[PDB]
Ligand binder design. Structure first.
Ligand SMILES: [Cl-]
Length: 99
């Protein structure tokens, strides 16, 4: 299950169904991906082709990234069947050394 959030907008959506903290056009895709992350027992179960699942690097080693739309990513740590530090991030703000 999802145990924690860094991004308040994601948290608000996941917990309350309130969409004000994410882009409105991304709500359905974000709900689907959060549900997938919340259900997964193993990181490998999130490896649907369209998610483009990949681990991050450097200071972000230990985090994972899946695609929502274009450059937007849901990122998280995944350990012992749970997900932590859920965030919604722009991939272009990552340096080459971090991906
Ligand atoms: Cl939290």
């Amino acid at each position: 299950g999802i145990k924690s959030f860094k991004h308040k907008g994601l948290k608000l959506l996941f917990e309350k169904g309130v969409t004000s903290g994410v882009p409105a056009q991304d709500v359905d895709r974000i709900n689907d991906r959060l549900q997938a992350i919340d259900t997964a027992t193993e990181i490998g179960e999130l490896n649907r082709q369209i998610y483009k699942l990949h681990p991050l690097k450097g200071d972000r080693e230990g985090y994972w990234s899946i695609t929502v739309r274009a450059n937007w990513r849901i990122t998280f740590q995944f350990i012992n069947g749970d997900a932590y530090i859920l965030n919604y991030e722009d991939a272009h703000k990552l340096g080459p050394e971090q991906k």
